[PDB]
Design a protein around this nucleic acid. Structure first.
Ligand code: MG
Ligand code: MG
Ligand code: MG
Ligand code: MG
Ligand code: MG
Ligand code: MG
Ligand code: MG
Ligand code: MG
Ligand code: MG
Ligand code: MG
Ligand code: MG
Ligand code: MG
Ligand code: MG
Ligand code: MG
Ligand code: MG
Ligand code: MG
Ligand code: MG
Ligand code: MG
Ligand code: MG
Ligand code: MG
Ligand code: MG
Ligand code: MG
Ligand code: MG
Ligand code: MG
Ligand code: MG
Ligand code: MG
Ligand code: MG
Ligand code: MG
Ligand code: MG
Ligand code: MG
Ligand code: MG
Ligand code: MG
Ligand code: MG
Ligand code: MG
Ligand code: MG
Ligand code: MG
Ligand code: MG
Ligand code: MG
Ligand code: MG
Ligand code: MG
Ligand code: MG
Ligand code: MG
Ligand code: MG
Ligand code: MG
Ligand code: MG
Ligand code: MG
Ligand code: MG
Ligand code: MG
Ligand code: MG
Ligand code: MG
Ligand code: MG
Ligand code: MG
Ligand code: MG
Ligand code: MG
Ligand code: MG
Ligand code: MG
Ligand code: MG
Ligand code: MG
Ligand code: MG
Ligand code: MG
Ligand code: MG
Ligand code: MG
Ligand code: MG
Ligand code: MG
Ligand code: MG
Ligand code: MG
Ligand code: MG
Ligand code: MG
Ligand code: MG
Ligand code: MG
Ligand code: MG
Ligand code: MG
Ligand code: MG
Ligand code: MG
Ligand code: MG
Ligand code: MG
Ligand code: MG
Ligand code: MG
Ligand code: MG
Ligand code: MG
Ligand code: MG
Ligand code: MG
Ligand code: MG
Ligand code: MG
Ligand code: MG
Ligand code: MG
Ligand code: MG
Ligand code: MG
Ligand code: MG
Ligand code: MG
Ligand code: MG
Ligand code: MG
Ligand code: MG
Ligand code: MG
Ligand code: MG
Ligand code: MG
Ligand code: MG
Ligand code: MG
Ligand code: MG
Ligand code: MG
Ligand code: MG
Ligand code: MG
Ligand code: MG
Ligand code: MG
Ligand code: MG
Ligand code: MG
Ligand code: MG
Ligand code: MG
Ligand code: MG
Ligand code: MG
Ligand code: MG
Ligand code: MG
Ligand code: MG
Ligand code: MG
Ligand code: MG
Ligand code: MG
Ligand code: MG
Ligand code: MG
Ligand code: MG
Ligand code: MG
Ligand code: ZN
Lengths: 204, 13, 174, 140, 37
RNA sequence: AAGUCUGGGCUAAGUGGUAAAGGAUGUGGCGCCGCGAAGACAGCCAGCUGGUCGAGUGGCGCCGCGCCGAAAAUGAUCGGGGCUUAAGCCCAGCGCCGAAGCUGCGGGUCUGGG
RNA sequence: CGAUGUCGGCUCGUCGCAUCCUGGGGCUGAAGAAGGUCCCAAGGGUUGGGCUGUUCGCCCAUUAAAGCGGCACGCGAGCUG
RNA sequence: CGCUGAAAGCAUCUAAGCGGGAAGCCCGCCCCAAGAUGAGGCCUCCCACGGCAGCCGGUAAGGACCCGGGAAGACCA
């Protein structure tokens, strides 16, 4: 397993073999390994990666310590990649070649308090023929005296989005190492400027 | 299946 | 009217060690461990092994014959050894060896490659005969069965993989 | 005269090797130790039972066909949220839970019985991390 | 396979076997194969 | 709360812990026939008879306890945990626990007799 | 009976399995393909219309299939009427 | 559906033992998750304060308040 941290920069399409292919551009590199988790010490295996450099004026003393023990300049984001242990002290985009499939994780756009139609694709109610103030309502939510209650997990209105989402098996269309750029085919969760994680795919 | 109502439709107070 | 008490001739020269819960039968073709009930007593006599049971109740009578045959099969295995033969009937159908492994051509869109497990050897005389040989009788019988399964005998045509000396029963077809 | 009531005393730590013992029949004894009903100054409303350490919980023994037929159950509160787990698999995945679940069901319900369960330390494998307390070996 | 509450010998070559807590009837004629249930 | 009590036996289904016609080489125990050291039954060697095998073998009925037959709707369960020469069932015992019943002690009322 | 709102539809499900499809099987009067019949299996799926208030049913065009039931004949402090 | 195999000289998937076998079951995938009071782990920072497992007084690492805001959001977060 291998992975890198990155920010989602935006979307476009490029042309390849007389085909328009939708892409999301990702600024991935460069990520210094700042800590390594070991089976002897941590009970599992992963690499703590750093991303984006940080104004030392904002780095508190416990954080300062952590970076210093790794001989690493202050970084904005710390995140682990599981079962990944790179030989180098720095992870860059070059760990991906064009043609590989990857899994991208982000924080989905937040819809705030969402209705049951947006959130769960409910049909809602009729818009004429007598419908009385229930056009976007969920209808019945249960039975009667048996069971006399509502199931846990009952789909209802509530917050929606701003949540971890991983879309899987995306084609790497291109990589531009001199600019720390990844071009992945299709869509990636979250807004432009959002932090994403690019891992080698688990699909076969 | 159609069976006879056992209550009248509610009239106003 | 009895198996367990009938004694087991032991050819010169195979050894039959006895441990609690098992017997070890070494011979000219290899070794084999026979797991044996603690309730049964094995006996090593001159050129003969006997198995004795404690009571004459159901479980004991049953374990008896079993144990004797189990050990007798181990003896014959390390001396004579065991083997089963397969006949391959059907026009397109043929077998061949590729190294140690067996390659079946039995009418699929591919050929089937069977790998020999430890203690099992494959032989192909004619391309229509297969010999499964080994010192373990249950293992030879098993692997043999496995091979036959790949393309069982048809019900309407003399076609497929057959046991040596297996009768060809067929049904009419329209 | 009024009945003697004990002031707080030091609890006895105890070691038990579960290997080869019948699940339920061992569980009974552990519960008794936990309740402290072997002590002549027993009192129903205080924790004055022993601390019981058990090792080789994976080598607990069971009669009949219960390895594949005894079924542990868990309800999640969700629709269809009833999980069924056989003895065989419970031992394969979390073997100490087997003995734990047995003893827990034989302790009183309520605040006290929950405390008594906490004084039960069960381990798979012959080693236990309680050298400091030096528990007295018990033959049961 | 026939699955019945009354499993019986159908012909002289039928054999009443009992395996795994269930009464079967195995035989040379495949039509006679029975399991109780 | 009081026996992991004692002795004999059965059951291997968790039967016990939810049911019927009927079905079954389940298991244990009785009973009655048939055949057989003049060689039966099973297998190998022939034509219901013969050859070596050298023991039993085939059938009917009854009793105890079990097996199937046995599909329903929110989450399961013999009250639970858990129980298999029992913590199940049948037979015979000894001891204990157990109610506001009975006893001991103290008291109150009414009634009867002093 | 000092009130437990009653058919059908809509919305939202969830369970059962005596399984409509899909998966795995045995038998077939199973040549092949396609069926029949029984067994295992409840993971998912189980279309859009014409008529009628209809549930149901018939019909059109399809479909892998167009399953049958329980949940106060599920669901009117959710809507319809 | 078998392999080996007695009880029961044969036979038998079974009584010892071993295989093969489902969109189902367990894992695997994705998301939540240590109030998992059984409250876990690792890295790093502060630290031995003054007065009579307690109280009071000021601090340390840090945190909050306040403000500019935000594809975060009803308020809160
Ligand atoms: Mg781990
Ligand atoms: Mg690794
Ligand atoms: Mg809106
Ligand atoms: Mg909307
Ligand atoms: Mg949505
Ligand atoms: Mg709508
Ligand atoms: Mg609609
Ligand atoms: Mg609409
Ligand atoms: Mg209106
Ligand atoms: Mg209105
Ligand atoms: Mg309106
Ligand atoms: Mg509504
Ligand atoms: Mg209502
Ligand atoms: Mg309820
Ligand atoms: Mg949120
Ligand atoms: Mg693809
Ligand atoms: Mg992240
Ligand atoms: Mg009517
Ligand atoms: Mg003998
Ligand atoms: Mg034999
Ligand atoms: Mg014909
Ligand atoms: Mg025991
Ligand atoms: Mg014990
Ligand atoms: Mg004790
Ligand atoms: Mg045991
Ligand atoms: Mg078992
Ligand atoms: Mg529910
Ligand atoms: Mg579920
Ligand atoms: Mg259910
Ligand atoms: Mg209680
Ligand atoms: Mg049938
Ligand atoms: Mg019949
Ligand atoms: Mg007959
Ligand atoms: Mg038989
Ligand atoms: Mg089976
Ligand atoms: Mg047969
Ligand atoms: Mg006893
Ligand atoms: Mg049963
Ligand atoms: Mg039971
Ligand atoms: Mg039962
Ligand atoms: Mg009956
Ligand atoms: Mg009987
Ligand atoms: Mg003869
Ligand atoms: Mg049953
Ligand atoms: Mg039921
Ligand atoms: Mg009902
Ligand atoms: Mg009771
Ligand atoms: Mg007894
Ligand atoms: Mg009284
Ligand atoms: Mg008195
Ligand atoms: Mg007087
Ligand atoms: Mg009324
Ligand atoms: Mg009222
Ligand atoms: Mg009311
Ligand atoms: Mg009503
Ligand atoms: Mg009401
Ligand atoms: Mg509606
Ligand atoms: Mg409508
Ligand atoms: Mg509508
Ligand atoms: Mg439901
Ligand atoms: Mg329904
Ligand atoms: Mg079924
Ligand atoms: Mg039916
Ligand atoms: Mg239909
Ligand atoms: Mg099918
Ligand atoms: Mg099917
Ligand atoms: Mg079919
Ligand atoms: Mg035909
Ligand atoms: Mg076939
Ligand atoms: Mg035909
Ligand atoms: Mg039928
Ligand atoms: Mg079929
Ligand atoms: Mg039918
Ligand atoms: Mg039917
Ligand atoms: Mg299903
Ligand atoms: Mg379900
Ligand atoms: Mg359903
Ligand atoms: Mg329609
Ligand atoms: Mg219509
Ligand atoms: Mg019209
Ligand atoms: Mg109309
Ligand atoms: Mg209609
Ligand atoms: Mg109808
Ligand atoms: Mg009609
Ligand atoms: Mg079809
Ligand atoms: Mg229709
Ligand atoms: Mg219909
Ligand atoms: Mg129908
Ligand atoms: Mg039905
Ligand atoms: Mg339905
Ligand atoms: Mg209903
Ligand atoms: Mg009704
Ligand atoms: Mg209805
Ligand atoms: Mg209704
Ligand atoms: Mg309905
Ligand atoms: Mg309904
Ligand atoms: Mg209602
Ligand atoms: Mg209304
Ligand atoms: Mg209505
Ligand atoms: Mg109401
Ligand atoms: Mg066969
Ligand atoms: Mg055989
Ligand atoms: Mg077995
Ligand atoms: Mg058995
Ligand atoms: Mg198997
Ligand atoms: Mg096979
Ligand atoms: Mg699939
Ligand atoms: Mg968390
Ligand atoms: Mg997380
Ligand atoms: Mg915590
Ligand atoms: Mg956490
Ligand atoms: Mg913590
Ligand atoms: Mg850990
Ligand atoms: Mg100092
Ligand atoms: Mg200081
Ligand atoms: Mg001081
Ligand atoms: Mg400060
Ligand atoms: Mg927002
Ligand atoms: Mg704001
Ligand atoms: Mg605020
Ligand atoms: Zn027959």
């Amino acid at each position: 397993m291998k992975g890198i941290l990155g920010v989602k920069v935006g979307m476009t399409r490029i042309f390849r073999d007389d085909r328009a292919v939708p892409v999301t551009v990702i600024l991935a590199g460069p990520c210094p390994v700042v800590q390594r988790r070991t089976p002897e010490k941590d009970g599992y295996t992963a690499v703590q990666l750093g991303f984006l450099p940080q104004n030392p004026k904002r780095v508190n003393r416990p954080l300062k310590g952590h970076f210093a023990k790794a001989g690493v300049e202050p970084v904005r984001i710390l995140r682990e990649i599981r079962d990944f242990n790179p030989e180098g002290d720095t992870v860059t985009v070059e760990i991906f070649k064009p043609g590989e499939r990857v899994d991208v994780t982000g924080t989905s756009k937040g819809r705030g308090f969402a209705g049951v139609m947006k959130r769960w694709n409910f049909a809602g109610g009729p818009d004429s023929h007598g419908a009385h103030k229930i056009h976007r309502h969920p209808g019945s939510i249960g039975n009667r005296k048996t069971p006399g209650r509502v199931y846990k997990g009952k789909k209802m209105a509530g917050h929606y989005g701003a949540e971890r989402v991983t879309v899987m098996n995306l084609e790497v269309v291109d990589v531009i190492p001199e600019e720390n750029l990844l071009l992945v085919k299709g869509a990636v969760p979250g807004p432009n400027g959002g932090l994403v994680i690019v891992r080698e795919t688990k699909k076969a | 299946v159609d069976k006879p109502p056992y209550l009248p439709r509610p009239r106003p107070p | 009217s009895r198996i367990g008490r009938l004694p087991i001739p032991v050819p010169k020269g195979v050894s039959v060690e006895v441990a609690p819960g098992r017997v070890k039968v070494k011979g000219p073709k290899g070794e084999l461990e026979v797991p044996v009930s603690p309730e049964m007593r094995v006996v090593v006599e001159e050129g003969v092994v006997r198995v004795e049971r404690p009571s004459d109740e159901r479980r004991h009578k049953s374990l008896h014959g079993l144990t004797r045959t189990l050990i007798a099969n181990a003896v014959k295995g390390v001396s004579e050894g065991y083997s089963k033969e397969l006949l391959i009937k059907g026009i397109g159908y043929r077998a061949r060896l590729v190294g140690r492994a067996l390659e079946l051509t039995v009418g699929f869109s591919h050929p089937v490659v069977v790998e020999p497990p430890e203690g099992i050897t494959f032989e192909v005389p004619e391309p229509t005969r297969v010999r499964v040989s080994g010192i373990d009788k249950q293992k030879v019988g098993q692997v043999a069965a496995n091979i036959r399964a790949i393309r069982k005998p048809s019900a309407y045509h003399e076609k497929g993989i057959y046991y040596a000396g297996e009768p060809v029963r067929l049904k009419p077809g329209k | 005269m009024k009945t003697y009531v004990p002031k707080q005393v030091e609890p006895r730590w105890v070691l038990i090797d579960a290997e080869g013992k019948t699940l339920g029949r061992l569980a009974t004894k552990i519960a008794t130790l936990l309740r402290g009903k072997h002590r002549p100054d027993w009192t129903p409303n205080v924790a004055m039972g022993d601390f019981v350490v058990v090792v080789n919980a994976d080598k607990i023994r069971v009669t009949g066909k219960k390895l594949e037929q005894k079924i542990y159950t868990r309800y999640s509160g969700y629709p269809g949220g009833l999980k069924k787990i056989p003895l065989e698999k419970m031992l394969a995945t979390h073997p100490e839970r087997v003995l734990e679940h047995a003893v827990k069901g034989m302790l009183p319900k309520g605040p006290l019985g929950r405390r008594l369960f906490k004084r039960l330390k069960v381990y798979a494998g012959p080693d236990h991390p309680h050298q400091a307390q030096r528990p007295e070996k018990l033959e049961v | 396979m026939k699955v019945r509450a009354s499993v019986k010998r159908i012909c002289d070559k039928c054999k009443v076997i009992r395996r795994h807590g269930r009464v079967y009837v195995i035989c040379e004629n495949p039509k006679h194969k029975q399991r109780q249930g």
